[PDB]
Each structure stands twice: as C-alpha cells, then as structure tokens.
Write an enzyme that holds these catalytic residues in place. Structure first.
Site, PDB file in Angstrom:
ATOM      1  N   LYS C 164      -7.990-100.663  59.074  1.00  9.57           N
ATOM      2  CA  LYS C 164      -9.194-101.375  59.497  1.00  9.57           C
ATOM      3  C   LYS C 164      -9.560-102.483  58.515  1.00  9.57           C
ATOM      4  CE  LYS C 164     -11.763 -97.802  59.271  1.00  9.57           C
ATOM      5  NZ  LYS C 164     -10.778 -96.946  58.559  1.00  9.57           N
ATOM      6  N   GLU C 190     -18.350 -98.821  51.021  1.00 11.66           N
ATOM      7  CA  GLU C 190     -16.918 -99.039  50.870  1.00 11.66           C
ATOM      8  C   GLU C 190     -16.538 -98.974  49.393  1.00 11.66           C
ATOM      9  OE1 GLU C 190     -15.818 -98.887  53.731  1.00 11.66           O
ATOM     10  OE2 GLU C 190     -13.835 -99.791  53.967  1.00 11.66           O
ATOM     11  N   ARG C 191     -15.286 -99.309  49.096  1.00 12.65           N
ATOM     12  CA  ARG C 191     -14.798 -99.251  47.726  1.00 12.65           C
ATOM     13  C   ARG C 191     -15.177-100.513  46.962  1.00 12.65           C
ATOM     14  NH1 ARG C 191     -11.205 -97.527  51.270  1.00 12.65           N
ATOM     15  NH2 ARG C 191     -10.367 -95.403  51.111  1.00 12.65           N
TER      16      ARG C 191
HETATM   17  N1  LIG Z   1      -1.097-105.054  58.739  1.00  5.39           N
HETATM   18  C1  LIG Z   1      -0.548-104.279  57.776  1.00  5.39           C
HETATM   19  N2  LIG Z   1       0.652-104.575  57.237  1.00  5.39           N
HETATM   20  C2  LIG Z   1       1.204-103.808  56.280  1.00  5.39           C
HETATM   21  N3  LIG Z   1       0.626-102.701  55.789  1.00  5.39           N
HETATM   22  C3  LIG Z   1      -0.578-102.285  56.242  1.00  5.39           C
HETATM   23  C4  LIG Z   1      -1.245-103.074  57.285  1.00  5.39           C
HETATM   24  N4  LIG Z   1      -2.406-102.459  57.555  1.00  5.39           N
HETATM   25  C5  LIG Z   1      -2.482-101.369  56.754  1.00  5.39           C
HETATM   26  N5  LIG Z   1      -1.397-101.266  55.969  1.00  5.39           N
HETATM   27  C6  LIG Z   1      -1.169-100.189  54.979  1.00  5.39           C
HETATM   28  O1  LIG Z   1      -2.385 -99.451  54.859  1.00  5.39           O
HETATM   29  C7  LIG Z   1      -2.922 -99.525  53.539  1.00  5.39           C
HETATM   30  C8  LIG Z   1      -4.340-100.072  53.589  1.00  5.39           C
HETATM   31  O2  LIG Z   1      -5.121 -99.304  54.497  1.00  5.39           O
HETATM   32  P1  LIG Z   1      -6.677 -99.640  54.699  1.00  5.39           P
HETATM   33  O3  LIG Z   1      -6.800-100.793  55.659  1.00  5.39           O
HETATM   34  O4  LIG Z   1      -7.327 -99.725  53.343  1.00  5.39           O
HETATM   35  O5  LIG Z   1      -7.209 -98.310  55.424  1.00  5.39           O
HETATM   36  P2  LIG Z   1      -8.701 -98.241  56.012  1.00  5.39           P
HETATM   37  O6  LIG Z   1      -8.614 -99.050  57.280  1.00  5.39           O
HETATM   38  O7  LIG Z   1      -8.930 -96.766  56.222  1.00  5.39           O
HETATM   39  O8  LIG Z   1      -9.551 -98.860  54.931  1.00  5.39           O
HETATM   40  C9  LIG Z   1      -2.036-100.444  52.725  1.00  5.39           C
HETATM   41  O9  LIG Z   1      -1.536 -99.753  51.580  1.00  5.39           O
HETATM   42  C10 LIG Z   1      -0.890-100.827  53.633  1.00  5.39           C
HETATM   43  O10 LIG Z   1       0.334-100.314  53.106  1.00  5.39           O
HETATM   44 MG   LIG Z   2     -11.360 -99.561  54.211  1.00  6.24          MG
END
Ligand SMILES: Nc1ncnc2c1ncn2[C@@H]1O[C@H](COP(=O)(O)OP(=O)(O)O)[C@@H](O)[C@H]1O
Ligand SMILES: [Mg+2]
Ligand SMILES: Nc1ncnc2c1ncn2[C@@H]1O[C@H](COP(=O)(O)OP(=O)(O)OP(=O)(O)O)[C@@H](O)[C@H]1O
Ligand SMILES: Nc1ncnc2c1ncn2[C@@H]1O[C@H](COP(=O)(O)OP(=O)(O)OP(=O)(O)O)[C@@H](O)[C@H]1O
Ligand SMILES: [Mg+2]
Ligand SMILES: [Mg+2]
Lengths: 478, 471, 471
Positions: C164, C190-191
């Site tokens: 996301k 968030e972080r």
């Molecule tokens: N479009 C993308 N391309 C490559 N890796 C992705 C992509 N989206 C998510 N990731 C993987 O997911 C991780 C980040 O997730 P994140 O977006 O922080 O999760 P959340 O949506 O729960 O915050 C990264 O370490 C990456 O490896």
């Molecule tokens: Mg997030």
C-alpha cells in the site's frame, strides 16, 4: 527525614492497593517497608494501584508505602558491558556490583521525524540467506517469526557473534525464558568471545509478571544511552509474545476490561512504544543508531494471528521460519516467499546489490513455478533451465551452525552461482563445491578479497571469470 | 493469642476475619478444629492456605479438604508458618498425602522430625549447571530422534488414552532399577487404582526403600491438587541439596495442577483469561517449574506427563509449558489408532541434545535422513488420499516405499505391555537402533513385507519375523 | 477565572472536576501547564480534549501526550473552544503535529494567523457535485480495470506488508508533480522512518513548496492518533472552501483512527462491540468520511490506504469502510508471494467509472474479457493441482496459457521500487495498456516465454526482453 506516606489496603498476585499518597505522580516509584520497589499505574480518586517489582510474600495489609519522587529508572553506563543483570539494573551473575553513575527514564519519547536519517549502511549477519534475500541495515528493526524449535535463537546468537570486529554493542534481552537456557546462551557467547561487548538482561519465568513486562523497556533504555553518544547498538528481544502475555495478566489483575482474546486494547500501543525507539540519528544528533530484532512465537505457523499481525504492521521487515523447510533439509529455513525487507538495496554493499538484487524475486517465482509445473511432465526448455537454477540456488543458500561467512566471500559465491558457472555441477555436490571454493580463495585470488574489502565493489569481471575457471579445472565431481 | 473467625464459605474458598494488627502472612497455614456442640453440627478438622488480603482485616484462603459442615462464626487458629512436610531418610519407603501425613498404615512420624516449608524461592543464576549428556532409555524412537538429557526436564504430551502412563511405567522399569540414586513419585490428579497398582508393583520389585511416594488424586478438592506437586518437590529438594545425591522425579499428569488452579481462581474474584483460565497461568507454572533444576550440589532429572485437552496442542496450558522443557515427546491419537505404539510423533518431538558433537556424526546424519523422508511422506498424504499410489513419480514411489517401513520400524514392544498382548518385549541399544535404521535407509530390506517391521526390535527380529511369515 | 482539577489518571484518560456554573462543552480543549514546586515534581505542558459529562460537575477527557508525571490536584484551564490549527498559505511547505505546531525547525507560526476549529458539521445534500472524470495514473492494472475518478474517494485496501505505501508513493510521484494545485499529506499512525523518507523525497523533488504535511506516526497516544487526520482534513478544507482550488489529499492508514478509538473506548466506559471495537465505530467513521467530498466551491480527491487486519476483508473496519469509497483496489498476499507487484487483485477491485460511456466501448470490452478469462482460470486451479495439465480440454489449455500471460503482464516496474527491483521504472498510457492487453487476448504473443511478461511496461519491452532471453 520527611516523605508522603500511604497505607496498603489489598495485596495479592503481585498487585497492591494503597490509601493515601496525595502527591504521587503517575508512573512513579514507591517502596514498601521491606524495601521492595513498586510502580504506581492507576491513580483512582480513593486509592492508587501499585504494581510490585519483587517477592510480595513479605507485604501485609496495613503496611506503609513511602513515596520516592522519581519516575521508573534504570542504571546505565559502560560498567554494564559483560554482565548479566535484572531489568532493575541489579546483577545476578554474582561478580559483584555494577559501578554505574547515571540513570535514564524507562519511558522516553522516540526521536522525531526531523531527527532521523535514512538507513544507508549494512549490518552483516554472516548468514547467506539473510544477507542476500532480506538485508538488514543499521537503524532498521527486523522481526523474526516462526514456530517453536525452528532456529530463531540460533539466528540471533550468530548475528551477535558476527559483530565481533565491527564497533557495535549488543544487548540480549531474555523474557520469560528458563534460567538454565539463559545460562547456556551466556556460556556459548563467552566461549565464542562475544561477552566483551554485550549485555544480557534476564527476567526468568519465576520473576513476577511486572518484571517481564518491564524488561524490554529496560533493554532499550540501556541501548539508547549508548546510541545518543554516537555508538552503534544491536538489541534482541527474545520473545515479545511473553511480554504480551505478562501485560495481559497484569491488566486483568488490575481489573481493566479485556478485548480480543482477553488482551487489553492497548497491546498495539505497547509494542509500538517499545519498537519505535529504534532509529538512525542524523548528523546533527551525532549519527548514532540502534537496531532491533524482536521475536514472535506463533502457533502451527499461523502468521495471520492477532499478535503476529500486530507486530508485523510495526516492524520494517520479517524473516519467516518454516518447520516444513526446517525438516526438509533447508536450514536456516528462510521462507523467501513471505520474508521481505523494506530497506533492501540501501542496506547492501555495491557488489552484493549488483549481484543479488533479483534473487528474492527469482526464488519466489521459482517456488511458484515448482508448485505449478509439478503437475505435468511435458516441460519446456526454459522451464527446465529455471528449475535447475532454482534447485542450485536453494542448495547454495543452505548453511550450517556457527559458521559465519565474510561478505567478500558471500558475494563471490553468489556471483559464481548467478553467472552460470554452477550450471553443470550436480545438485548434490554444491556444498562441497563451495567448501573447496573457499579453500581455494584462501590461497589464490586473495587480491580479489582485498579489492572487495577495500572498495566495496565487484573486481574486474575478467579476473572473476579466470579465477572461477581455474578453480573449476581442479574441481572434480565426486 | 491471635484467632480468627469464619465469615464466608464458597466451595473450596473460605474467608477468615482476624483481630486487628495480627493478620497472617500469605501462604501460611490455618487450622480449624471444632467439636460438635449438639446434634445439629458435625466435627470438623481442616486446614487452610492463605491466598489474599482483602482489606478490613479479612483474609481469603483455600481449603485443603471438603468444606462441608463449616459454620459462619467458627474459630480459626493460625500457625505462623507455611505447610511443613517431613524430610530426610524418614520419607524413604512411605506414602504421603499433601499435608505430609503417612497413609501407608505403617505408623506415624515422630513429632520431632525435621520438616521444611513447602514454599521457597527458586535457585539463582550462579548455582545452575549446564552439562549435557545422553540418558539411554532403550526405546528406539526416543534414543534416535529425541535423546533424553541426564539431569534435565523431560515432558510427555498426549491426549486421552494415548499411552503416557504406559510410557512412564516402561521408563521406570528401564531406568529406576539400575539408577542407584533416589526416586520420588508424585501422582497428581490420577487414578487411585493406578496409584495402588504402582505401589504394589514397586513393593514386589523391591525398588521401595529408596523411593518416596506422594498422592493427591482425582477425588481430592482443588486445594490438595494445587499443592501435592509442591510437597513432592520439597521432598526431592532435600535429597538434592542436603545430601548431594542424584534424584529422579516422576510426576504424573502435571496438567491437573493448572486445572485445579483454574478451578479455584474463579471464586477468588479474578477475571477470566482467554479460555477461562486464571490470569496467573504463566507465573503459577513458572514458580513450580523453576525449582526443578540441577545445581552444583546435585542433579534432578524429572519426567513429567502432560495431558492435552481435546487433543488441542494450541490450548494455553500445553502451550505455555513447552518453554520449560528440554526434550519433549508428543504422542498422537492418529498413530495410536493405526496400531503403532508408543505412537510418538517423529517430527513434532524435539530435544536439545540432538547435536552432532553430543550424539555423533553417524547418529546425527541417520536421524536427519529419517526425518527428511518422513517429512516428504507427510507432504504426499493429500495426493495419496485421492489418487492413490498410481499417479506418483518413480522417486516418490520409493520415498513412500521406504517411509512406510521406517514408520513401522519406529514401533516397539514394551515390557509393560506384556500384560496386554503376551509378547515378552525387548530392550534395544542406541548403536543397534542406529545400525538398523542406517541399513533400512540404504535399501537392504526393500524386499520384505511392511508387516514384518511392526512391534519388534534389533532388526534381526524383523528378518526372523519375515522368515516366519514365509519370505 | 474558573478552573478545574484532576481527579483520576488512568493511562490516556483523565478525570477533571470543575466548579459549578461552568462545564466545558464536548470537544473543548483543556490545558495543563503545571510547574514543579519542588524537586519531587516534573513540569508538564499537556493538552486535553473533552469526551463525556459524567455527572456531578465532572468531565471525562482524553490526553494528547503521555500522562506520566501527572499529580492529582493539578489545575486545568478551559480554553472555551476546540483545538484550532493555522490555515492558509502559511501552512504550505511546513510539517505540523496534531496541535498545529510546526516541527520542521523553520520558525513558529505568528500568533495572529487565522485558525479554524477541527470539528464541524458535514456539507449539506444540496452542495455536492455529480460529474465524473477519469484520472490517468500510469499504472496498467489501475488504468485498465479500476480507473480512478477525479474528485472522488479512492481506497487502497490490503494486509500488512503487501504494498500500500509503495503504491501510494508511486501515485504521488506520478500525479503530484504536475497536478497543478494544492496537495496535503496526513501521516496517521505510520512509521517515522517512512515519514522522514517521504519528506526528504518531496524536499528533493521540490514538490514541498506546494504541499503541507501532518504526522501522528504510531508513537503518539490514541488521543493524537484520533485527531491528526481531522487536522489535515481541516487544512485541506480551508483550501477547498475559501480558494476553490483542486486539492489532492493523501491519508496513510486510516484504520489507525478506529484502532485508537477502540483503544480508548473501554477506558471511556462503553460496552464492548462484536470484535472488541467501540459501538460508535460506524458513526465515528462516517462523521469523518462524509467531510471529504467535492462541492460546487471546489473539488477534493482523496487517496486513502486502508489496513486489513489478519488479511480478513470481513473484519468490521474494512467491511464498514467499503461503503464510503467510489473506486477501490484490493491487495492480497497471494499475488505478493508469487512475486508480482503491485499485486492488485483483478477481481475484487471495482470502480464506479467503469462504464462504456465514460471510458469507451472498446476499453469496457477489453476489461470484461480480461476479467472473464481470469475468472475462468481461477476455477481450474483446483482440479489442475491433482488431475494434471493434460487432462484438461484443448480450449481450456489455451485459456490457462493466455491467462498466465495476462496475470504476469498485469505487473509493472515502479520508479519508487528501484531499491527492490534494480530497474529504472516505467510509465505507460491507457491507450498502450488497452492495445497490449487486446493483443495478448487475441493471442498475437502466445509464442513468447511465460517469464518475459513480468515487470516490463509495454509489449515492446515484453518482446525486447524475450529477444534478450534468446527467443
Ligand atoms: N511495486 C513493488 N515492487 C517491488 N516490491 C514491492 C512493491 N510493492 C511492495 N513491495 C515489497 O513490499 C515491501 C514494502 O511493503 P509496504 O508497502 O511497506 O507494505 P504496507 O503496504 O503494509 O506498508 C518492500 O520491501 C518491497 O520488497
Ligand atoms: Mg505502510
Ligand atoms: N543450521 C542450523 N540453523 C539453526 N538451527 C540449527 C541448525 N542445525 C541444527 N540446528 C538446531 O535446530 C534447533 C533449533 O534452534 P533454536 O533452539 O535456536 O530454535 P528456536 O525456535 O529459536 O528455539 P526455542 O523455540 O526453544 O526458543 C537447535 O537445537 C539447533 O541446534
Ligand atoms: N506400548 C503399548 N503397547 C500396547 N498397548 C498400549 C501401549 N501404550 C498404550 N496402550 C494401550 O492404550 C491404553 C492407554 O493407557 P494409558 O494409561 O497409558 O493412557 P494415557 O494416554 O496415559 O491416558 P489417561 O488420560 O487415561 O491416563 C493402554 O491401556 C493400552 O490399552
Ligand atoms: Mg529459540
Ligand atoms: Mg494415565
């Protein structure tokens, strides 16, 4: 002498109700007649809820409680290095007292958004799978999650041991463990020589639940004292599920209404407070850092449970350990499909990045392709090649126990794998191939290791090919 | 004089109100004696354990016996010390209850015998020992996949009617006879029939005069079941410390201890936990478990049976106790129904001692190969259940062909089970079982029928049974 | 003046008793500005928000910071108005906390600046707008299946660690660069690392000159986590109303709002709802979501990331927040484990703009054909696993072979994901997406290898990757 004095009303199960204490502060320290310390949490109109931090068999109704005028605090300093100590800063190893000279509050605000700098330097764990698929950088917090008897403690011990050369301080916090197990871990650390720069904080299962609840906060308070002076700290929480259970017990004893699965509603806040203090400070703050590796113990590999998801949403990445992979010969059994690192790339050196940027994605694709193509024998040439490469990579990633490997050799072996020089070795011979390759690199091609160690970049690709071919000519298939 | 007065009676929980300034300490023992004043009363002789301080000079206690006949306003006497239990050479060869009174009809203990309080803090960090060495038991699966550790804690998990008691009896037969130290048996929440049978068996075998026995059984109220284990433990601690002798502790169904704690906790005013358990489940278990340790003065090796309610290994009581053990064996109802005994799960069972330098390289490799084959066979089960063997690849055919034989060879015929089947049973050494499993893995017996591998030991018996069957 | 005093302190909830004649209205902001009289006290500068009227001139409040150091009897000052934050062009290029205080170390806001109350009633029925326009994003799956609506509410569902935040960063990079209007970002729960990274990314790109930010960031108490979102909302509402601008509003993890509400409900004293949430969940969510709309004065388009607990879309929070959105994208871990990103589910994701008269008949036909082919593929996944690929019919083999290509082509290489991918990233228009998907459906690229369709962008990149692979 003068001090505000209260009197006890109720005692039981490590919780005391007291009357009086007009000017007690929320979250303060109090001491009973026996000298057992206590913490004040609930400031009700008529009474104060006191949480006992010791053996409460000596406290009787009608005793007097004396205010101390201080928030919860723990001793800090270089004198704690190489010692096993209670969360209160009281030694248990029996080697005399600790000559600390200052304290830090156990409840402190985390560094703000304008205080931090993006993670940009690596934390070498000496494990090929972790260092290639889910890299960890200084200032990052990474969760290790899995069932019982899978390898979480061993991974943490290897990570701590490998930090011998770097200017890093380690903190190992054991919560709810068994004292003999803690002593065994301490003995292994001493044997491998890691006690010169590490601190062990222990709160065994015999200790009252308040000490288990406070232990990780004490550990992070000890760590950030070094962090704010420009040092680098590594913190390992041996089990946060134990802390969650202890906090649930304490809250239920305080008659606070429960939520899901009898957990208090603020468990997410508790864990967020604990884990948000890890940071990579900017240059204005001295540039210090603190990295954390909390542990979570699941039931039957159910990663979709309450506490697992709550912790996962907080940390940067997770290393998921699988019993099926553990018993199938794959160790440390990193399930690359579910494992991920949100700071990937920025936490790897240049050579490692340019060699293994795509390894995790390729391995996940290979896992899916192996699952699918198992359902048919008429396979294409490309699928056959991908299956062979995936099998060889899986064989490469296996590693024994207490065998750390320098990154300058990890990069070489992964390069040899990914450039196709392993395409002809049978899958059963890859371990011996790697052993012989390290032995041959220890004599020939030492300048390659020197160049990698100095410039943190791949050497000239011609020399790599020449050395690999020279080793392959003397290599013989069993 | 400092005397109380009964205020409330709610099942096994009794409230006493004391004169001001003389409240007893927690874990003290209170005595209630009362001769019947007339025909509308009954004589009462009962003891209580303090549990809480409620306020207004009122104390909440837990009774160690049935509270029938208690009358509000009766007089209660305090002793000023926790429950005290006789210790020493006197306790060897006798049978005790939770209060330390002998029940073997052999007489009574003198009033001047040394006795010690039940409650005490756990041993400290600097006193513990760390040495690890193997304890050979003569059971194939235990000695191969999860070796027992001398001086450590061993746990046996199982549902209802799976074989924990038979396994404990076999362990007693194979170890206690030659142990040479001191044994103590503490049955908690088990059948008085089993207790009597075990006592008579030990008397016949002569193991008594070096053992002590303590019994809090199913018929007892939760008060006695909460403390019988502690009584046995404080008997064993004397032999550990004051004499520096090896002590062997057998506990039967330690789960009843936490169950009794849960039963009592409801009436004490505590709010329920996840599955209705007490909030203090972890600390109550830890206080008992932390005292069963080996120190520099001596070593205690403890074997505990752990019941699992409704075969749910995710239940909080089995789940929390996994961290207190060194080697665990998990019995399985699916294996028990299949006819393989002792039905030990080969993959769930773990042990800290299974290390290459502790058991040897050959042993380590053989165990790992066996576990790998069993894991693959477990993976194949879903496809097997529908399409059968006929769709498997050539390699998986061999994997199943060998996994069946390994699984069957993991079974054994116990000495204790001779009363169930009439087969004499056998005792096998570690080297023999390792050699047999290595031979099976090498494929030296792929021509034998799978039924020949069942309920035998020493592999030569497998060959002989196949020959008798006509192979 | 009139003042209250502190009666109870229970975590993030504080009781205040006021003198008769003046009770603060609900949602009023109270202040505590105590100074240490002696050594045994600590200075406090804390603010409170009124929640309840308990009776007997007593108020139940929620704290905006840690309550450590509070003492019963401290003086509380009533401000007579809700929390107010500065609005206008002063806010642009700054970072604020919940209370509207800058934290960017760039200088404090002047005391005479215009400020607005956080709480206000939602816009009337007659003020709303109804037009629909497609907002091009540059992502293949979003642009094809679930188009985004300018001036509408968009939600990005998903579990933990699914993508996301990365998707929202990619959307920011895609649209905010050339949006030609005001932008607002709200960091709810968030972080802090992510917040700092985003802030420095905007500082580098120069977009910081036209945007404003607020951060709660997961470490502040639920009092602040329940109001940072509303602070950002009123900051955007000023621009929508008084200037008629076009506003982009980005909210990260709106689920943290209801999570904090559930955290504080029990201490407020409400009865628990089904899954432990507060009873007022639906109304509390509605009173916030209904304020984020587009009216005749101006249009606000909002992109909200919604966290799904335990990957369960039937959880009450996602279940109730689904009804507030115009176009949604559902992220699930199944596609994440296969290594395809952004892992948008091509079935659950829906958009109200997907109509023939809005996107075009050919676009609608391509989308429907892709959806039905993927649905047909999803049904064969079960029988294939145990009946093999051969036993299917010839046409079903074809639909599986083409659906694999569709599924692998739905992925894309993001500019932001450079760290995780090692590739620069690509931007592709709707026309290219629809033409390429039509060609893949018609089978012009059945010969190309399966592995060549992932993380590519255009079909030109697909064929170039296949050629470089040797085909
Ligand atoms: N479009 C993308 N391309 C490559 N890796 C992705 C992509 N989206 C998510 N990731 C993987 O997911 C991780 C980040 O997730 P994140 O977006 O922080 O999760 P959340 O949506 O729960 O915050 C990264 O370490 C990456 O490896
Ligand atoms: Mg997030
Ligand atoms: N290569 C290996 N990596 C990890 N563990 C290994 C390896 N080879 C053998 N083991 C064994 O696997 C077991 C699991 O290790 P460990 O006890 O650290 O796991 P854990 O799940 O963290 O433990 P616990 O749940 O008891 O805290 C240990 O007995 C260890 O010796
Ligand atoms: N090794 C064995 N050989 C043959 N039969 C066995 C063996 N182990 C158990 N059984 C059978 O299973 C029964 C289980 O008896 P046991 O008392 O050991 O059960 P348990 O699992 O401890 O259950 P409970 O909760 O009733 O104590 C035995 O009475 C016997 O019929
Ligand atoms: Mg471990
Ligand atoms: Mg039994």
């Amino acid at each position: 002498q003068v001090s505000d004095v209260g009197t006890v009303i109720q005692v039981g199960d490590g919780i005391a109700r007291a009357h009086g204490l007009d000017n007690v502060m929320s979250g303060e320290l109090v001491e009973f007649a026996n000298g057992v310390m206590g913490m004040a949490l609930n400031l009700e109109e008529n009474n104060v809820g006191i949480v006992i931090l010791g053996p409460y068999t000596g406290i009787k109704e009608g005793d007097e409680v004396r205010r101390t005028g201080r928030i919860m605090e723990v001793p800090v300093g270089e004198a704690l290095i190489g010692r096993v100590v209670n969360p209160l800063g009281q030694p248990v190893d029996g080697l005399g007292p600790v000559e600390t000279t200052e304290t830090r509050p156990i409840e402190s605000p985390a560094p703000g958004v304008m205080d931090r700098r993006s993670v940009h330097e690596p934390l070498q764990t000496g494990i090929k799978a972790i260092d290639a698929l889910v890299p960890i950088g200084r200032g990052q917090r990474e969760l290790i999650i899995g069932d019982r008897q899978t390898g979480k403690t061993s991974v943490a011990i290897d990570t701590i041991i490998n930090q011998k050369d770097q200017n890093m301080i380690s903190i190992y916090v054991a919560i709810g463990q068994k004292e003999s197990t803690v002593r065994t871990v301490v003995e292994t650390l001493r044997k491998h020589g890691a006690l010169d720069y590490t601190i062990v904080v222990t709160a065994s299962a015999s200790q009252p639940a308040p000490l288990l609840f406070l232990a990780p906060y004490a550990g992070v308070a000890m760590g950030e004292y070094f962090m704010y002076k420009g040092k680098h700290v590594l913190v390992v929480y041996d089990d946060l599920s134990k802390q969650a259970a202890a906090y649930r017990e304490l809250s239920l004893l305080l008659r606070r209404p429960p939520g899901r699965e009898a957990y208090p509603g603020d468990i997410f806040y508790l864990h967020s407070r604990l884990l948000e203090r890890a940071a990579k400070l900017s240059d204005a703050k001295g540039g210090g850092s603190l990295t954390a590796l909390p542990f979570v113990e699941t039931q039957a590999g159910d990663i979709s449970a309450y506490i697992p998801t709550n912790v996962i949403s907080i940390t940067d990445g997770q290393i998921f350990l699988q019993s099926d992979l553990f018993f199938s010969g794959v160790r440390p059994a990193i399930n690359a499909g579910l494992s991920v690192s949100r700071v990937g790339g920025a936490a790897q050196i240049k050579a490692m990045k340019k060699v293994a940027g795509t390894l995790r994605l390729d391995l996940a694709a290979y896992r899916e392709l192996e699952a699918f193509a198992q359902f048919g024998s008429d396979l294409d040439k490309a699928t056959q090649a991908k299956l062979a490469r995936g099998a060889r990579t899986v064989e490469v990633l296996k590693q024994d126990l207490h065998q750390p490997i320098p990154v300058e050799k990890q990069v070489l072996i992964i390069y040899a794998l990914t450039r196709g020089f392993l395409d002809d070795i049978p899958v059963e011979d890859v371990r011996r191939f790697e052993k012989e390759f390290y032995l041959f690199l220890d004599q020939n091609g030492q300048h390659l290791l020197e160049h990698i160690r100095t410039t943190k970049d791949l050497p000239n690709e011609d020399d790599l090919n020449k050395a690999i071919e020279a080793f392959k000519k003397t290599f013989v298939v069993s | 004089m400092t005397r109380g007065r009964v205020i409330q009676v709610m099942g096994p929980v009794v409230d006493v109100k004391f004169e001001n300034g003389h409240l007893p300490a927690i874990y003290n023992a209170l005595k209630i004696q009362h001769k019947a004043r007339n025909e509308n009363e009954v004589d009462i002789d009962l003891t209580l354990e303090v549990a809480l301080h409620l306020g207004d000079d009122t104390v909440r206690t837990i009774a160690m016996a049935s509270t029938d006949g208690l009358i509000r306003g009766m007089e209660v006497i305090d002793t000023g010390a926790p429950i005290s239990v006789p210790v020493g050479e006197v306790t060897l060869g006798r049978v005790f209850n939770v209060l330390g009174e002998p029940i073997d009809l052999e007489g009574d203990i003198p009033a001047d015998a040394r006795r010690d309080p039940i409650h005490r803090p756990a041993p400290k960090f600097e006193e513990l020992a760390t040495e690890v060495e193997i304890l050979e038991t003569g059971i194939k699966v235990v000695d191969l996949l999860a070796p027992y550790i001398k001086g450590g804690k061993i746990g046996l998990f199982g549902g209802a009617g799976v074989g924990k008691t038979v396994l404990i009896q076999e362990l007693i037969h194979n170890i206690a006879q030659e142990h040479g130290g001191i044994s103590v048996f503490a049955g908690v929440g088990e059948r008085t029939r089993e207790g009597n049978d075990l006592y008579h068996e030990m008397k016949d075998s002569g193991v008594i005069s070096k053992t002590a026995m303590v019994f809090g059984q199913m018929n007892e109220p939760p008060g006695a079941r909460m403390r019988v284990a502690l009584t046995g433990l404080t008997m064993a601690e004397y032999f550990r410390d004051e004499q520096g002798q090896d002590v062997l502790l057998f506990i039967d169904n330690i789960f009843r201890f936490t169950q009794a704690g849960s039963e009592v906790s409801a009436l004490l005013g505590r709010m329920p936990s996840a599955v209705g358990y007490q909030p203090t489940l972890a600390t109550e278990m830890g206080q008992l478990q932390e005292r069963i340790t080996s120190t520099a003065k001596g070593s205690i090796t403890s074997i505990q049976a752990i019941y699992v309610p409704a075969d749910d290994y995710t239940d909080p009581a089995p789940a929390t106790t996994f961290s207190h053990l060194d080697a665990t064996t998990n019995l399985e109802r699916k294996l028990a129904e299949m006819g393989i005994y002792p039905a030990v799960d080969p993959l769930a069972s773990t042990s800290r001692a299974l290390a290459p330098e502790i058991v040897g390289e050959e042993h380590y490799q053989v165990a790992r190969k066996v576990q790998q084959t069993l894991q693959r066979y477990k993976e194949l089960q879903d496809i097997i259940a529908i399409l059968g063997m006929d769709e498997l690849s050539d390699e998986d055919k061999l994997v199943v062909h060998r996994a069946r034989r390994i699984q069957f060879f993991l079974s054994q015929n116990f000495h204790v089970a001779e009363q169930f089947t009439g087969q004499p049973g056998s005792y096998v050494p570690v080297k023999e079982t390792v050699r047999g499993f290595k031979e099976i893995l090498e494929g030296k017996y792929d021509h034998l029928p799978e039924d020949a591998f069942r309920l035998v030991g020493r592999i030569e018996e497998v060959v002989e049974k196949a020959k008798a069957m006509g192979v």
